[PDB]
């Protein structure tokens, strides 16, 4: 049922967003050092 | 002479080792950024793209 | 959706209401930049208003 | 060094999760703040005088 | 919520009432700093007053 | 000579030992401060942040 996919796909997107969210700080971390 | 010259190699080598470590995370971080950003737009293309948007 | 449109215009309204003082006293440059920021919210505001009407 | 690096990691996150206000707003409030004190004080010097 | 707004203005009022003497005798510098402290309370006071009205 | 030189090592070493201890708590305290402050804003972001505020 495509409807469940819509919700599921965004959930997978949310994990990547936080994954990218954490990654940016790592770049900032080395910059300060 | 041997002890003096060999130390210079060690003195120079150690400086290079940490220098590579500094760039290790820098390139790793950039790779992860693109990797994370690579998929999200692919989902949007598979989700929203008017050609074959699964969403609309 | 209606609430967001009202909120966004208020943000521009505060900039617009603030922009009245920024332009005041002849300090045009402050007003110049302020209105440029407003246009970003204005474009978003128009899109929502169209969405509200069709949803009716 | 290893401990202090972790400090930056936590430090770097706060700005990301709480984006600092742009330098725009700083000058506007500072520009407005002087008028707030001066305009209010303009009455202060005027009411007493 | 109403009580807090009244209390905060009183704090500024005491500074304002005090500021009358601070500005008095020509000691402007004391008054200059005093009013700067007041603005912090004034900003808080305005926010509450708006909250009181909508709650009505 | 041996007893004199060895004491100098002990005399110097002991001074360093307490010096490290002084910085031990200093860095530990800073770490705890950030650790405590790290989570509270995360809760606020999870609680108040207009994007997906669980509160409002």
Author numbering:
A (entry chain B): 24 to 56
B (entry chain A), F (entry chain w): 113 to 168
C (entry chain C), E (entry chain y): 57 to 112
D (entry chain v): 169 to 217
Provide passages from the article that reported this PDB entry.
The main effector of the Psp system is PspA, a 25 kDa protein consisting of six α-helices connected by short loops and an elongated hairpin, where the N-terminal helix α0 of the protein remains unfolded in the absence of membranes. Interestingly, PspA is related to eukaryotic and archaeal endosomal sorting complexes required for transport (ESCRT)-III proteins and has a similar structure. Here, we show that rods of bacterial ESCRT-III protein PspA internalize and thin membrane tubules by overcoming the required bending energy through progressive membrane binding of the N-terminal helix in the PspA assembly.
For the truncated PspA α1-5 sample, the total diameter distribution was narrower and ranged from 235 to 290 Å, with two maxima at 255 Å and 275 Å that were closer but not identical to the apo distribution of WT PspA. None of these structures contained any additional lipid density in the rod lumen. Although the PspA mutant lacking helix α0 shows no structural alterations in the helical rod structure, it can no longer tubulate EPL membranes.
